[PDB]
Design a protein around this ligand. Structure first.
Ligand SMILES: Nc1nc2c(ncn2[C@@H]2O[C@H](COP(=O)(O)OP(=O)(O)OP(=O)(O)O)[C@@H](O)[C@H]2O)c(=O)[nH]1
Ligand SMILES: [Mg+2]
Lengths: 169, 61
């Protein structure tokens, strides 16, 4: 079954596609009925990484302001996080510093974070360039992938890469 | 082959209290984990529920 157990967070602005990413990862389908996360969703999945089985306990947090206290209470103990923005929404990208600060403060400075530029399937609507996001990631010691919960592009890869880095520096 | 419980399916509106809302969520996930015989997840979620209820009580002071 599993050799390791990593607690993962999915964090970022409301509407960035956090729940859809979790649903894509586990159910390999784009979630049809989606609505603002009404607190914090849970998912569990075991992956083969670094020659080992790693069970991920994933807490998909709410981005909405009224759930800030509730979502923040999930941070402690998290070994990894997918920090998500929407590539079509500059405001979601602008909010990354506050998400990142709070995550590293409330979980260890050790938390391994992969930046996810989600909804990359909506490239016509792009408001954040890959290169500027890569720069932000480089500067803040983040892994970085652009993802699509809709097509599944880079979704499994985001979770796998996060786990991989926890295991091997 | 992972597991992902339905978000307190097709039910009431969002609770006026965000923590009580989260408690409803976990309670629903526990019911589904129990029903699926996933004792690891039952234990994980029950531990989370325990922490949420403690935090709720403390807020009432
Ligand atoms: N085209 C496209 N739409 C997406 C993608 N991911 C999410 N969406 C849509 O974006 C909207 C928000 O998705 P959610 O997964 O509910 O966003 P969230 O981050 O969980 O929002 P909160 O629960 O409020 O924190 C939904 O209408 C989804 O259908 C994507 O990768 N591509
Ligand atoms: Mg959500």
């Amino acid at each position: 079954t599993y050799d390791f157990l990593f607690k993962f967070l999915v964090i970022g602005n409301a509407g960035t596609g956090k729940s859809c990413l979790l649903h894509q990862f586990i159910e390999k389908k784009f979630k049809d009925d989606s609505n603002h996360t009404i607190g914090v969703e849970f998912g569990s999945k075991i992956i083969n990484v670094g020659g080992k089985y790693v069970k991920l306990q994933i807490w998909d947090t709410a981005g909405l302001e009224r759930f800030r206290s509730v979502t923040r209470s999930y941070y402690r103990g998290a070994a990894g996080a997918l920090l998500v923005y929407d590539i079509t929404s500059r405001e979601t990208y602008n909010a990354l510093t506050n998400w990142l600060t709070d995550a590293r403060m409330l979980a260890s400075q050790n938390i391994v974070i992969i930046l996810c530029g989600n909804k990359k399937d909506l490239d016509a609507d792009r408001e954040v360039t890959f290169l500027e996001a890569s720069r932000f990631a480089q500067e803040n010691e983040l892994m970085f992938l652009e993802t699509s919960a809709l097509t599944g592009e880079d979704v499994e890869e985001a979770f796998v890469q996060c786990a991989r880095k926890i295991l091997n520096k | 082959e992972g597991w992902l419980p339905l978000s307190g399916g097709q039910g009431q509106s969002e609770d006026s209290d965000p923590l009580l809302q989260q408690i409803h969520n976990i309670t629903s996930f526990i019911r589904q984990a129990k029903a699926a015989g996933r004792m690891d997840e039952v234990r994980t979620l029950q531990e989370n529920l325990r922490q949420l209820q403690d935090e709720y009580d403390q807020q009432q002071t």
